[PDB]
C-alpha cells in the first residue's frame, strides 16, 4: 500500500481558478413558489389521492390473502378496544360509554384518511390522562349528573380543539415536528407518564373518592388522597384487581414466549372480563361486597354537540400538548410497522387523519385518542394486514354501543383498572435506560432523568414543554466548551494530529495549527477566543497595543531630535531617556488598537528585535496561524464577528492567518456575512493543513 | 510549490499501531474533587482576595495619575445618577426617594465586591420596568392612597432582595457563564422591544395621565390604550416642557458625541436642563399656574431596614429570576466593553456575587433592583473614570442629595425626568436597522431578532425573554435540521474530493460512493441523514436484504424439492419455468427477512449481482464500497449512534464495505463508550482520510 500524491499547493481560490466549476443556479424561494402553484392535471390527481388514501389501497386489496386475516385481527382488536375505551373513559372521569364513542369515530375516519395499515386508532392511557387534566382545569376556570354533563361537554371541546390543531399542522406541512423529541426524552416522558397512570388507577383498585387534582404535582396530591383514606379500601375490589392483574401478566408472557407455537395470541383480557362479569353477576358483588360496577349505559349514540368557546379559551395550551403527544405517539407506533412491512408513511396525512378523527369524535361527544401500542400490537400480532381490520374493530365497538352493552353493566371498575395497569409493564421497565444512558452518553441520561422529573412534578403537558426546552439546551451543553487542540505533524507527511497525543511530533517553526472540533456560534465564541489565545501563547491585541505604545514613544523621541532616523537602524544621539509614559486618557486610549503604519519611517521596524532607547515590547515567535475548520459546521452572526476581530488582530501584528479544511459552501456563506475586506481576504483559505504548511514554508524560505 | 506525499495507506488502527500513543492520565472527577478542597495557604489567600477585589486594587492605586480624574468622573456620574434614580423610581411607581436609595446602596457594595472599574452601578430603565411589573403582580396576587404606595414599596424591596439572592446564589455556584446563552441578536431585539416599552411607559408623565398598573401579557397595548383613551386630558405645560427638554438634550448629546475632541469634558446637559426646569418651575409657580406634577417633598434621610415578605417572595419568584438574569446580562455586557477597552480581567462570578449583595442590601434598605445603565457607565468613563472611586464619589453625592439638598428637587416636574429617559432611549431605539442587515447575512439570526422583538412586545419583558431564549435554542436545531448532504468525487487524479455536482471532469471510482454530511448528527437529523444516504447510493440496503432472503428461501425450498441441484459449478436446473408461488410470510415470521444471509451450507458462493436461475429476480447493485466523510460531523448522540449502527449493519449484510473517515481521536473514543463496535461492525471501518479509504478499496478490488 502506498499513498502517493504529487500535486501543486492549492489555496481554495487557486483550486477554483484551475478547475471549471459547474455553474449551478440555486432554486430561489420565488421559483419554489411557482412550481408550488403548477396546477398540473397529474399533480392534482396525486394530491387528492394523497388526501384520500383509501382510494389507492382499497382497490388493490388482496382478498384471498388478507380478508380472513383482517377479520380475525379486527374482531380480536375490537374486543380489546371496547375494554380499553371503558378504562380510558374512567381515566377521563366521564361515563364509560363515551370511551366506546372514542373507540369508534377516529378508527372510522382514519380508515379513509389514514396511511398506516396496522395501527389501532383510539384512546391510550397517557392521552386520556392529559384530556382528563384539561377538563378538570376547564371546569375550575368557568365563569358561572350535572357534573358528569359538564365534564363530558369539556372532554368534547378539548378533543375538537386538539384535532383542529392537528388538522392545522397537517395542512401547513409541519409533519416533521416529531424530530424535536429524542429517544431519551420520549423514554423519560413515557415512563413518567406510566407512573402517572399507575397513580391514577389507585382510586379504582381501592374504590376511593379522590378530587380532580390538577398540576403541578398532581400525582402526589392523588397519592395523598388515596393513602390518607387507605383504610376505606374495598377488599373485594382489591383482591379482584390483584387477581386480574396477576393472571393477565402471566398469560401475556406466555403469549410473548410461545408466540411461535401459539396460532393466535391467547385473549386473556376478554376471558378475564367475561369471567369477572359472570362471577360478579352470579354472586351479586355489587350488593354482596359493594363493589363499584360500570353500570347501565345508554344503548345508542349521542346527538352532535357544539364546541364551547369558553372551554376552548381555557384549555388551548392543554390541547396543544395533547395534539403534539398524540401525533408523537401514533407516528411512533405506525413507524415501527412501516419499517417492518416496507410501506411509506406520510406524517402530514397522519396529522390530517388524526385531526379529522378527533374532530368527529369531539363533535360526537368522544375524547381525544390516536393509538395505543398495546391495542396496535394486538392488531398486528393477530394478523392485521390493512385498515379493514380497524374497520372491523370499530364495527365490534358499534355492536357493543347499540345492542350488547348491557352485558358490561355488572363489570367492576377495578377490573378495568387492573387491565390498564397490566398494560404498563413495557413503559415501567424503561427505568433500565438510566444506567445504559449513563454508560453511553450522559447528556442523554440528563435528558431522560430531567424529563422524568419534569413530567412527574409539572405533569404530562407542562412536563413535556420544559423537557423539550431542556433537550434543546443540552445541545448547547455539548458544544459550549469544545475541546480545542493544537496540532502537530507526525511522520513527516500530510498527517496532523493532536500535539499532546503522540511522540515525535513536529511543529514547523513559527507555525501554530489550532483545531476547534465543533460549530462556532454565540454560546462558544468567547471560549474559542480564550483557547486560541492560550494556544498561541499571547493576546494579539495586547501585543498590538504595546507595539503602538512603543511606536508612539519612538515618534515622540525622534521628532524631538533625541533619535535620528537612518536607513540602517535606530541610531540615538543621546542615551539619556528618562522614565515616562504617555498616560493616554479615556478618550484617546483607543488609538492603540489601530494598524501600525510605519511608512513614515524609512526603515522597517523589526518588532521582534530590540528597539532603541530600551523600549520593551513583548516579542512573538508566531508568524503563521492555521485554523483547522474541518469540523466547524456553521457560524452565526455572533461568531463571524468574533472571528473577524480575532483575525484582524493577528493580521495587524503581522501574523498570517490560514483557514483550512472548509468546503465551498462554507466560504459561500461567509461571503454573505461581509467577512472579507481589505485586511481579511479570501487568499487565507487553503484546502488542507498541509497545503497551508507548504505555502508557509515556501514563503519563509 | 508542489504538494508531494509518499506514505503508506492508513486505517485509524494501523496508524495507532505504527505510531506509539502518548499515555495520558485520567482527569477523574474524584481527583478533581480532591483539588477542590485544597486548603492550601496560598489558595486560601487567592480565594479571599478574589472575593474581596478592593483588597487588591486599592493598595495599587495611582494617586497622582488617577485621583483627580476619578473625582471629576464621580461628581459627573453622581449628578447623573440622582436624576436617573428619580426617573426610574417613577418607572417603578414608587416615591422618587427610593430611586436615590437604589442609586446609593448597590454602588457602595460594588465598590467592595465588584471587579469592574468603569461601570456605574444602579438602576436602568429596563430593570425598573421589570421590577414595577413584578410589583404590580405581587400586589395583585396578595391575599387580603399612601397605603397603596407603601405596599408597592414593600413589594419592590422584597422583589429586589429575592433578585439579589438569586444572583448571589448563581455566583456562589460559579455559573457566571450563563451570559453565553443570550446571542447578540436576541439581546438586540430584546433591548429594542424594551426601549419601546420604556418609551410607552413614559407617556403617562409627558401627558400627565392616570394609567392603571397593567400587567403582562400585552401590557404595552393596555397602556397605550389607557393613555390615548384620555388624550384629551393631556396637560399642555407638561408636554411642552418635556418636548423642549428632549430637543435640547438630543442636540447637545449629538454635539457631545461628535465634538468629543474640542470638549475637555462632555457638556452636562441633564444637569443643566434639570436646574433650568426646576428654576422656571419654582419661580413661575408652574405647579399652581399650570397644575403640573412635580417631584414633591422627599423625606430627608434613609429608611430603617425592612424584612422581606415571604408572601411577596412566593408571588414573584419567576419575576425575580428574570430581574436577576437581565440585570446580570446587562451589567456583564456593559462591564465587558470596558474590560476589553482597558485590558483588565473581569470575573463573571464575582460580578454575580457583587450584584447580588448590592441588590440584597438595597432591597433591605427600601431600594429597587439595578445592575448598571449603559448611559451612566458611559458618563463616568467619558469623564475620566479610572477606578470605582468614581462610583464611591457618585454615591457620596447621592447621599448628599438624600440627606441635605433633596428639597431642591421639589419643584421639578416629572415630565422632565421622562424626557431625560427618552433622550437616553434613542440609542436602543436606533437598533431597528439590524433587521435588514441580518436579513442579508443570516436569516436565522434575523429570525432570532424578529421573534425576540415580538415575544417581548406581545408577552412580557420576563416571559418574553424566556420565550426568546427558547426560540434561539430552537434555531440551532433549525440550522442543523436538513443538512446539505452531498456526494463527492475525485478531482485532479489526486487526493482532492469535492462535490460531485460542482466541477467538470470529475471521477467516481467504479463501485465507490463517497457521502458527506456537513453537520453533527443527532436526534433531529438522523432520519434525514438515512434518507439522503439512501437517495445517494440509489437503493435501500434493507429492501435488498429482504429480497435476497426471500430469493434464498425460494432457492432452498426448491432444493428441498429436488427440483434443482447444487454443485460446485452452481445451480443446475433439470426443470425450468418453475411455478411462481410467493411464500406470503405472516406478521410473526416476516422478521426472518432481515437476518444476515448465511449460505455457508451451500457449496458454492452466490453472486447476487449475477442471474439467478428459475425466474428468480433480485435487484442488482453496483455499489461495493461506501465511504462516509464524517469530517464535519462534530458529535453523535445516542439516537444517532443507534440509527447509524442500524444503517451500517444493513450495508454490511448486503456485502457492501463501509468506511468512516476524516474523524478525530476523541470522536472514535466516544463511540467506543456507546458500545457501537461489535463482531459485525468493527473499528477497521475507520480510516484517516477519504483517499486512504479509496486506495484501500482499489487495493482490495484489484
Ligand atoms: C408553525 C408553528 C405553529 C404555532 C402555532 C401557535 C398558535 C398561537 C396562536 C394562538 C394561541 C395563543 C393565544 C390563544 C389563542 C388566540 C385567541 C385568543 O384570543 O386567546 C384567548 C385564549 O388564550 C389563552 O388563554 C391561552 C394562552 C396560550 C396558551 C397556549 C400557548 C402554548 C401552546 C402553543 C405551543 C406553540 C408551539 C406549537 C407546537 C405544538 C384569550 O384572548 P381573548 O379571549 O381575546 O381575551 C379576552 C378576555 N378573555 C380572556 C376573558 C376572553
Ligand atoms: C413519584 C414516583 C417516582 C418514583 C421513581 C422511582 C424510580 C426508580 C425505581 C426503581 C428503578 C429500578 C431499576 C433500576 C435499573 C434496573 C436495571 C439495571 O440493570 O440498571 C442498573 C444500573 O442502575 C440503574 O439503571 C438504576 C439507577 C437508579 C434509577 C432509579 C432512580 C432514578 C430515577 C430518576 C430520579 C428520580 C428522583 C430524582 C431526585 C432524587 C442496576 O442493575 P444492577 O443489577 O445493580 O447492575 C448490574 C450490572 N449492569 C448494570 C451492567 C446490568
Ligand atoms: C407596540 C409598538 C410596536 C411598533 C413596532 C414598529 C417597528 C417598526 C417601525 C419602524 C422601523 C423603521 C426602520 C426600518 C429600517 C430603517 C433602516 C434601514 O435601512 O432598513 C432598511 C430595510 O428595512 C428594514 O430594516 C425595516 C423593515 C421593517 C421593520 C419594521 C417592522 C418590523 C418590526 C417587527 C414586526 C412587528 C410586527 C409583526 C407582526 C406583523 C430600510 O431602509 P431603506 O432606506 O428602505 O433601504 C435602503 C437600502 N438599504 C436597506 C441597503 C439601506
Ligand atoms: C386547519 C384549520 C383548522 C381546522 C379546519 C377548520 C375547523 C374545522 C372543524 C370546525 C369545527 C367542527 C365542525 C363544526 C362542529 C360544530 C357543529 C355544531 O352543530 C351541532 C348541531 O348539528 C347539533 O344538532 P342539535 O339538534 O343537537 O342542536 C342542538 C341545539 N338544539 C337545536 C338542540 C337546541
Ligand atoms: C368483548 C365485547 C363484549 C364484552 C361483553 C362483556 C363480557 C362478556 C360477559 C359479560 C358478563 C357475563 C354475561 C352477562 C351477565 C349479566 C347479564 C345481565 O342481564 C341483564 C338482564 O336485564 C337480563 O338480560 P336481558 O336480556 O333481559 O337484558 C336486556 C337489556 N336490554 C337489551 C333491554 C337493554
Ligand atoms: C376470575 C374473575 C375475578 C376473580 C374472582 C372474583 C373475585 C373473587 C374474590 C371475592 C372477594 C373476596 C371475598 C370478599 C372479601 C371481603 C369480605 C367482605 O366481607 C364483608 C362482610 O363481613 C360484611 O359486608 P359489608 O358490605 O357490610 O362490609 C363490612 C366489612 N366488615 C367490616 C364486616 C369486614
Ligand atoms: C423548520 C422551522 C419551522 C418548524 C415548525 C415550527 C417549530 C416546530 C417545533 C416546535 C417545538 C417542537 C414541538 C413542540 C414540542 C413540545 C410541545 C409542548 O406542548 C406544550 C404544552 O405542553 C403546554 O401545556 P401547558 O399546560 O403548560 O400550557 C399552558 C398554557 N398557558 C396556561 C401558559 C397559557
Ligand atoms: C446563595 C444562597 C442564598 C443567598 C445567601 C442566603 C440569603 C442571604 C440574605 C438573607 C436575607 C437578607 C438578610 C436578612 C434580611 C432581613 C433582616 C430583618 O431585620 C430587619 C430589622 O433589623 C429591622 O429593624 P426594625 O427595628 O425596623 O424592626 C421592625 C419591627 N419592629 C421592631 C419595628 C416592630
Ligand atoms: C443634582 C444634585 C443637586 C441638584 C439641585 C437642583 C438644582 C437647583 C434648582 C432648584 C430650583 C430653584 C431653587 C430651589 C427652589 C426650591 C427651594 C425651596 O426652598 C424652601 C424654602 O423654605 C426656602 O429654602 P430654605 O433655604 O429655607 O430651605 C431649607 C430646607 N430645610 C433644610 C429646612 C429642609
Ligand atoms: C429648560 C427649562 C424647561 C423648558 C422651558 C419651560 C417650559 C415652559 C412651558 C410653559 C407652559 C407651556 C404651556 C401651557 C399651555 C396651557 C395654558 C393653560 O393655562 C392654564 C391656566 O390659565 C389655568 O390653570 P390650570 O392649571 O387650571 O389650566 C387650565 C387649562 N385651560 C383649561 C385653561 C386650558
Ligand atoms: C454547563 C453545564 C451546567 C449548566 C448550568 C445550568 C444551566 C443554566 C442555563 C439556564 C437556561 C438559560 C438561562 C436563562 C435565561 C433566561 C431567563 C428567563 O427568566 C425566567 C423568568 O422570566 C420567568 O418569568 P415568569 O413570568 O415565567 O415567572 C412567573 C412565575 N409563574 C407566575 C408562572 C409561576
Ligand atoms: C414614536 C413616538 C410616539 C408614539 C408613542 C406610542 C407608540 C410607541 C412606538 C412607536 C414606534 C417606535 C418609535 C419609533 C421607532 C422607529 C425608529 C427607527 O429608526 C431607524 C433608523 O434610525 C435607522 O436608520 P439609520 O440610517 O439611522 O441606520 C442606523 C444607524 N447607523 C448604524 C446606520 C449609524
Ligand atoms: C420537587 C421534586 C424534585 C422533589 C420534591 C417533591 C415534593 C415537592 C413532593 C413530595 C411529597 C409531595 C407532597 C405530599 C403531600 C402533599 C399534601 C397534599 O396537600 C398534596 C400536596 C403535597 C403537599 C405534596 C406536594 C409535593 C411534594 C412535597
Ligand atoms: C401576537 C402577535 C404575534 C401579533 C398580534 C398582536 C396582537 C395580539 C396585539 C396587537 C394589538 C393588541 C391589542 C390592542 C388593544 C387592546 C385593547 C386593550 O384591552 C389592551 C389589549 C388589547 C386587546 C391588545 C391585545 C394584543 C393585541 C391584539
Ligand atoms: C406554578 C408552577 C410553575 C412551574 C414552572 C416550571 C418552569 C421550568 C423551567 C425549566 C427551565 C430549564 C429548561 C427547560
Ligand atoms: C396568559 C398567556 C400566556 C401565553 C404563553 C405563551 C407562551 C409561548 C411560548 C413560545 C415558546 C417558543 C419556543 C420555541
Ligand atoms: C406523598 C406520599 C404520602 C402521602 C400521604 C400518606 C398518608 C400520610 C398521613 C396522612 C394522615 C391524614
Ligand atoms: C393598540 C394600541 C392603541 C390602543 C388604542 C389607543 C386609544 C385609541 C382611542 C380609544 C378611545 C376609547
Ligand atoms: C360466562 C359465564 C356466565 C354465567 C352466568 C350464570 C348466571 C346464573 C344466574 C342464576
Ligand atoms: C405555554 C408553554 C409553552 C411551552 C413551549 C415550549 C417550546 C420549547 C421549544 C424548545
Ligand atoms: C416560567 C418560564 C420559565 C422558562 C425558562 C425557559 C428557559 C429558556 C431555556 C430553555
Ligand atoms: C495563609 C493565608 C490565610 C489567609 C486567611 C484570610 C482570612 C480572612 C478572613 C476575613
Ligand atoms: C437656577 C436659577 C434659579 C432662579 C430662582 C429664582 C427664584 C425667584 C423667586 C422670587
Ligand atoms: O399510553 C400507552 O401506554 C399506550 O400507548 O399504550
Ligand atoms: O436600560 C437601559 O436603557 C440602560 O441600561 O441604559
UniProtKB/Swiss-Prot annotation, chain A:
Catalytic activity: hydrogencarbonate(in) + 2 chloride(out) = hydrogencarbonate(out) + 2 chloride(in)
Predominant location: membrane
Activity regulation comment: Inhibited by acidic pH.
GO term, biological process aspect, one: chloride transmembrane transport
Tissue-specific expression: Expressed in the colon. Expression is significantly decreased in adenomas (polyps) and adenocarcinomas of the colon.
GO molecular function list: bicarbonate transmembrane transporter activity; chloride transmembrane transporter activity; chloride:bicarbonate antiporter activity; oxalate transmembrane transporter activity; secondary active sulfate transmembrane transporter activity; solute:inorganic anion antiporter activity; sulfate transmembrane transporter activity
Protein name: Chloride anion exchanger
Organism name: Homo sapiens
Gene label: SLC26A3
UniProtKB/Swiss-Prot annotation, chain B:
Keywords tagged on the record: Antiport, Cell membrane, Chloride, Disease variant, Glycoprotein, Membrane, Transmembrane, Transmembrane helix, Transport
GO MF annotation terms: bicarbonate transmembrane transporter activity; chloride transmembrane transporter activity; chloride:bicarbonate antiporter activity; oxalate transmembrane transporter activity; secondary active sulfate transmembrane transporter activity; solute:inorganic anion antiporter activity; sulfate transmembrane transporter activity
GO biological process, one term: membrane hyperpolarization
Reaction catalysis annotation: hydrogencarbonate(in) + 2 chloride(out) = hydrogencarbonate(out) + 2 chloride(in)
Alphabetized Gene3D superfamilies for the sequence: STAS domain (3.30.750.24)
Domain STAS: 502-697
CDD domains associated with the record: STAS_SulP_like_sulfate_transporter
Protein origin, superkingdom: Eukaryota
Cytoplasmic side: 1-70, 115-118, 174, 256-319, 373-388, 468-678
Topology of the protein relative to the lipid bilayer: Multi-pass membrane protein
Expressed in which tissues: Expressed in the colon. Expression is significantly decreased in adenomas (polyps) and adenocarcinomas of the colon.
Subcellular locations according to the entry: Apical cell membrane; Membrane; Cell membrane
Extracellular side: 92-93, 196-234, 341-351, 410-446
Transmembrane segments: 71-91, 94-114, 119-139, 153-173, 175-195, 235-255, 320-340, 352-372, 389-409, 447-467
InterPro entries noted in UniProt: S04_transporter_CS, SLC26A/SulP_dom, SLC26A/SulP_fam, STAS_dom, STAS_dom_sf
Activation and inhibition: Inhibited by acidic pH.
Associated pathology: Diarrhea 1, secretory chloride, congenital: A disease characterized by voluminous watery stools containing an excess of chloride. The children with this disease are often premature.
Similarity remark: Belongs to the SLC26A/SulP transporter (TC 2.A.53) family.
Subunit structure: Interacts with CFTR, SLC26A6 and NHERF1. Interacts with PDZK1. Interacts (via PDZ-binding motif) with NHERF4 (via the third PDZ domain); interaction leads to decreased expression of SLC26A3 on the cell membrane resulting in its reduced exchanger activity.
Function: Mediates chloride-bicarbonate exchange with a chloride bicarbonate stoichiometry of 2:1 in the intestinal epithelia. Plays a role in the chloride and bicarbonate homeostasis during sperm epididymal maturation and capacitation.
This protein's name: Chloride anion exchanger
Organism annotation: Homo sapiens
Name of encoding gene: SLC26A3
